[PDB]
Structure formats: C-alpha cells, structure tokens
Amino acid sequence: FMVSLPRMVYPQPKVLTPCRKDVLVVTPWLAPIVWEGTFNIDILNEQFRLQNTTIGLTVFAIKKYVAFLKLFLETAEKHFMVGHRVHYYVFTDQPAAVPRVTLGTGRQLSVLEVRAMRRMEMISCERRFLSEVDYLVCVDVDMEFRDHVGVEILTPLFGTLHPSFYGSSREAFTYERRPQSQAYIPKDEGDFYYMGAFFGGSVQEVQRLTRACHQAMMVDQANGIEAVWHDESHLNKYLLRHKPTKVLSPEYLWDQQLLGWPAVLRKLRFTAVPK
C-alpha cells in the first residue's frame, strides 16, 4: 500500500511543452528513457522514501581491479541514492584489499569473497538479496560517480544505452551475429545496444535476467561457442526479448576521454576511469 504524498509546490508540467525535444524520452513499449529534464527528483524521492526503499549495489573487484574500489565507493557516497537506504555488495578475491570507506547514515557494505561472464552466476546470492534489498543495481567497478544517480532509475527492469552506439543504426550494433549462439540477434532485430556495465531492477527481475543469461552462457560453453561480447551479448538478447521498463540514457554510462561531452548530455553521471 502506497500512502498519500504530502502537499508539494513545484512547476506545473505543461502538456503542450515537452521537457526535451532533442531526444526520444519514451520507448515504443512505453518505458521512460531517463534523461536530465524528464523527472522531478523531489516527487520521485518522496515516492520512494514513502516505500522505505532499499537499493543494493553489486560490484566485482577481482585481481587488480580492487584498486578501483576507493574512488568508486567514495563517489558513490556523494552521488548514488543519497537519502535512501543502500547496501553495497563487493565481490572480491582479496577481502583485505577492500578500502575502509566512510559511509553516510543508512548505508552498509558487505564484502563477499569469491574465486578469481561469471558475474551472472554469482549474482544469481539469491536468497540474501530477496531478504535485504528491494532493487539491485549491477555495475562495473572501473568507474566513478560524477553527478546524481538516484531513484529515477528504479523500476522492475532497466538497461543502459551503450555510449558508443546510442546514435547507431541496429545493423551496426555489435550483437552476437552467429546463429549457433544463444545470444544471436539477426540484423533486422534490436531496439538498442545496452552496455553490460549498468543494469538493474527489482531483485525478482534481476534474478530472472542473471539466471537466464547464466543458463544461456552454459549452453554456449557446451556447444563450444563464446559470444562476441560475453555476458553483454546475452544481456542484449535478454532485453530484446524482455523489454526493460526503463532505459537509462548515456548520462548514466559515459567515457569523457573517448567521447568528450556532447551537448545532448546535460550531465555526465557515471563515467569510466582511465585504465
């Protein structure tokens, strides 16, 4: 049950004036595509805080990539779901190399040791997540938050537009093109090319996605075939056949060194760290 929002004073939306004219802000299956200027974060914050939303954030830091955790976590503290309950799950082969990062109130971190693709299996921890968080967000570690990433992304299932391909025609997408792989997508299929570095949803829908991608990867392995972009090729096959209920714009996954700062991006929120 959702209780009533309180009175709020904010600018009136006007139906004969679009927030954004330069970009597609809703997909053809009526999922919002999240760009700056499309949401009033005060409305969304009230909605999700009235549900006492808890967001889990999964990150893998194996072998050398433990070096990225300090900046990743410190900038998450400044920008990710601030004011909401957050549980970080750091999966690593070196628990002792996880940096001591100071966290704001209502936020926790758990270190999960693993052995040094396999993110999908490791994500699909199933019972722990169901008991502890409402949404899971699954991101790459070699990244930093530079601006707000909050509850506007939460929905039962989301993917993020790959920053090299958002202006591309589908035939240019680097989907798996061999019919012998479970990730195969023909040249006349595809809505978007999603990046495997940032996806999420409710814990139920993220367990469905990571179970189906892990099953499809095992089939490929049995058949002696490895998809061109690994779990990313499987995530793209999944999201073509199970449409996401929101799509994040490339504000949410950018590489300023490679791609600069185009005008269509009003904010660069989560970016690659030089490596």
Ligand SMILES: O=c1ccn([C@@H]2O[C@H](COP(=O)(O)OP(=O)(O)O)[C@@H](O)[C@H]2O)c(=O)[nH]1
């Ligand atoms: O030796 C490795 C290689 C990969 N990763 C994890 O797998 C993610 C995806 O790999 P990577 O960032 O290298 O892919 P890229 O973005 O360069 O294509 C990394 O962010 C880490 O979270 C890791 O922890 N250790």
Ligand SMILES: OC[C@H]1O[C@@H](O)[C@H](O)[C@@H](O)[C@H]1O
């Ligand atoms: O073509 C797909 C690839 O595009 C690259 O730019 C990216 O570094 C890879 O991880 C993969 O997403």
Ligand SMILES: [Mn+2]
């Ligand atoms: Mn990466």
